[PDB]
A paper describes a structure:
In order to achieve the proof‐of‐concept objectives, we chose a 24‐mer human H‐chain ferritin (HuHF) nanocage as starting materials; subsequently its original Asp residues nearby the C3 symmetry axes were mutated into Phe, and the resulting mutant is referred to as 3FF. One ferritin molecule consists of six C2 rotation axes, four C3 rotation axes, and three C4 rotation axes. Here, by a combination of the multiple, symmetric interaction sites on the outer surface of protein nanocages and the tunable features of phenylalanine‐phenylalanine interactions, a protein engineering approach is reported to construct a variety of superstructures with shape anisotropy, including 3D cubic, 2D hexagonal layered, and 1D rod‐like crystalline protein nanocage arrays by using one single protein building block.
Therefore, to elucidate effects of ionic strength on the assembly behavior of 3FF molecules in solution, we fixed pH at 9.5 and carried out a broader screen of salt concentration (>200 mm NaCl). Excitingly, 3FF molecules self‐assembled into 2D equilateral‐hexagon‐like crystalline protein arrays in a solution (2.0 µm of 3FF, 20 mm CAPS, pH 9.5, 800 mm NaCl) upon incubation for 1 h, whereas wide‐type HuHF and other mutants could not form such arrays with identical experimental conditions, demonstrating that our designed π−π interactions play a key role in the above self‐assembly process. Consistent with our design, each 3FF molecule keeps interaction with eight other molecules along the C3 axes through the Phe‐mediated π−π interactions in the crystals. However, different from the aforementioned 3D and 1D assembles, the intermolecular π−π interactions responsible for the formation of the crystals are composed of two kinds of interactions (intralayer and interlayer interactions), demonstrating another kind of anisotropic π−π interactions for 3FF assembly in response to different external stimuli (pH 9.5, 800 mm of NaCl). Joint I corresponds to two identical T‐shape π−π interactions, while joint II is composed of a pair of offset stacked π−π interaction. Calculated results demonstrate that the intralayer interaction owns the highest binding affinity, largest buried surface area and the shortest distance between two C3 pores, suggesting that the intralayer interaction is the main driven force for the equilateral‐hexagon‐like morphology of the 2D crystalline lattices. What most interests us about this 2D crystalline lattice is that anisotropic Phe‐Phe interactions enable 3FF molecules to pack preferentially in the ab‐plane, finally producing equilateral‐hexagon‐like crystals. The strong planar π‐interactions could enhance the growth of monomers along the hexagonal layer in the ab‐plane, so the 2D sheets observed under fast nucleation conditions were equilateral‐hexagon. The slipped‐parallel hexagonal layers stack along the c‐axis by contacts of weak π−π interactions, so the final crystalline arrays are thinnest along the c‐axis.
Author numbering:
A (entry chain K), B (entry chain B), C (entry chain C), D (entry chain I): 5 to 176
Write the structure that this text describes.
Amino acid sequence: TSQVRQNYHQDSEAAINRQINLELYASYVYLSMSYYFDRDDVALKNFAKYFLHQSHEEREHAEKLMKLQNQRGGRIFLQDIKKPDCDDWESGLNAMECALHLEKNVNQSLLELHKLATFKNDPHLCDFIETHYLNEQVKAIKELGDHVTNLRKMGAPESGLAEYLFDKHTLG
Amino acid sequence: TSQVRQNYHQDSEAAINRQINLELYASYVYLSMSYYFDRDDVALKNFAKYFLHQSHEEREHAEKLMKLQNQRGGRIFLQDIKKPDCDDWESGLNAMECALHLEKNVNQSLLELHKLATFKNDPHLCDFIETHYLNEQVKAIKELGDHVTNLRKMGAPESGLAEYLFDKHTLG
Amino acid sequence: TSQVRQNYHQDSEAAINRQINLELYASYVYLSMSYYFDRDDVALKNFAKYFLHQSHEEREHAEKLMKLQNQRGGRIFLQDIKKPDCDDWESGLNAMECALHLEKNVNQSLLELHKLATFKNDPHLCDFIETHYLNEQVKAIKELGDHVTNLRKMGAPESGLAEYLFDKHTLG
Amino acid sequence: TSQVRQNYHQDSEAAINRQINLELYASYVYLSMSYYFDRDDVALKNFAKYFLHQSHEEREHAEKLMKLQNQRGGRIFLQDIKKPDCDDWESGLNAMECALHLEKNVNQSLLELHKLATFKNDPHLCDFIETHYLNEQVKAIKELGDHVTNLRKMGAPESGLAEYLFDKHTLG
Ligand SMILES: [Fe+3]
Ligand SMILES: [Fe+3]
Ligand SMILES: [Fe+3]
Ligand SMILES: [Fe+3]
């Protein structure tokens, strides 16, 4: 056992390793979405910037969790990162809704991790999660809500002008 | 009786207290409107900016009359700040129209003060209303009229595109 | 129902709405205190500055709570802001004593609000209160108790010198 | 008759000359008060600089009215500047209460002058009094009232320590 390990239950260790996988998965979904909007037949390059930047942020989330795992004396076990559920994301509003849906899954997973950490009386782990993940799930979910709503009210996905104007004025 | 009081009728002091409660109420309406446009199913960030600024500006008006109450030797007596009429403001256009109605009422009230203070031969009080309040109201009314007109022409409130663009290109 | 709402209970949404009102009321109490010390027969700029600053901070607390409500997908419902209890706050010491009382009641509301968030397993809400509200109350309470201590030891409210010199040296 | 007179009554010219004389008198009262506090047996150096400042402001008020008299085409007529009622002003608190009484008398004089300008329908002479003299009198009376109030609670005039600290912290 690790000379640093203190108050770090192996269920919390197991859960952090599968949160690490979900954060890498999330980053890969976003990578897929970003380069979808790069396509010459979609061509929304602020949608592409937006999802690429969320792709990088979600990789920082993974490494933070991996750093946490070593800080606490657990051992990273990496898993396959599954390909995203869709090669084709259909529209800007559809990707935004898929992202909002992904972000709610990721957040549900973080709420479970926190419930477990709470059950395991790991206040450093709870604080770690509250400090670095919980509010930025709320913030990202709220921001995608904002985005989904404006896109709908602008007349997406049926309107091509809606996704264009949103791309320049909200995402530029 | 106040050692500074001079030519300050008890009727003007009571009227000043009433206007203070109007200005606080106006502040509260605008606060209400602002965080409506911050909802995830309205999501108009600069409509929300605009009204929150108005709310702070109204709070300045209230405080300036309380300064005046004291400068003249009157005594401040505050009342309840009633909640605004609506919790839901329907749309950007309807909010602007409500705000336009509220400004004309506040103007009505200030013109009544001025009239009273004329009746009571209070030339310093008449100049105070004129210098700090009356032309602020003509400006605010003329602005909300400008906004109300533009949103109507753009096709608000049926057209979600209209309010989206107005928020970016006028309230931004 | 709201597309961003996740793990946000009805009960917690109601409390936030009540806390918004309490913060608004405390902003109003401090404003009443501010212009009491602006009076010609009271005359203490620094008590009045101190309290106006607190009125404005409390206004900021109330707005961050409305930002949260929207962030989490709940709905703000504003109510009347009650007038404060006193019109004459008697003395600088007595205002400091009532301000201390107000801050402890607001803390009681925040502690109860945090406890409900625990009960509903809202770890994000819990973190929100800890970060922005709980230590603010503990500092605000300690500062106010320090002020009452010095005002009493100086001879207040009997001594007009006591309060005059505190106004210059502590609040300057 | 002056090539520049228009809507300027014989009575208004005469009341301006009366007001010039009053401002010169008030400057002369403050100068007397100034060097009372410069005496080796009063020795309140900031009371003296305060009242020399007031004395010089009053000299500027008189000059502004002489400039107005010539702006409207009326003719300046100077009278004796009577000596102040007092050579000995007894105490700083006493000098302030007397100053308060002076600025209320000069105010009542300016209110009667604005009433006359109204009587004669001189909107320029009215606004001149409003812009330049009315709010200054309201502020001078309030500030003196504040000083009188603080001196009293501090224990003036029986407390020489009070007048000394007042001179340091308020007036220095
Ligand atoms: Fe994440
Ligand atoms: Fe106003
Ligand atoms: Fe607070
Ligand atoms: Fe003067």
